[PDB]
Amino acid sequence: XEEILSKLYHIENELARIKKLL
Amino acid sequence: XEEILSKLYHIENELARIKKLL
Amino acid sequence: XEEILSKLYHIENELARIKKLL
Amino acid sequence: XEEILSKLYHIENELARIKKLL
């Protein structure tokens, strides 16, 4: 489902931004 | 699905902290 | 739901272990 | 709910990396 899926992607993107910093 | 969403808010929030706090 | 919820908790706990390291 | 679970595996995996890699 839509609002769950978007927040999952958002989390993935936050983790992608963190991966980079590290 | 209110529990899953609630946990994803918390997670999202923990990561935006961690983010910033880096 | 059960296997989704456990993995959400697991993630929270990983983030708790990360919070500490940081 | 196979998509949500799949995204949670990926996330879990990204965090155990980040973990370790710290």
Side-chain angles (χ1 to χ4, degrees), chain C residues 14 18, chain D residues 11-16 18:
Chain C
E14 289 173 289
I18 290 153
Chain D
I11 282 159
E12 207 202 326
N13 292 160
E14 280 167 292
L15 284 170
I18 278 174

Side-chain angles (χ1 to χ4, degrees), chain C residues 3 7-8 10-11 14-15, chain D residues 1 5 8-9 11-12 15-16:
Chain C
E3 179 195 23
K7 211 141 246 39
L8 282 163
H10 190 153
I11 286 156
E14 289 173 289
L15 289 161
Chain D
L5 181 58
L8 295 173
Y9 277 114
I11 282 159
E12 207 202 326
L15 284 170

Side-chain angles (χ1 to χ4, degrees), chain A residues 7-18 21-22:
Chain A
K7 211 141 246 39
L8 282 163
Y9 293 119
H10 190 153
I11 286 156
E12 285 183 341
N13 296 161
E14 289 173 289
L15 289 161
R17 303 151 211 167
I18 290 153
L21 303 161
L22 308 173

Side-chain angles (χ1 to χ4, degrees), chain B residues 3-16:
Chain B
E3 186 173 356
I4 288 160
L5 181 58
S6 179
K7 304 301 169 193
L8 295 173
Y9 277 114
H10 185 50
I11 282 159
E12 207 202 326
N13 292 160
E14 280 167 292
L15 284 170

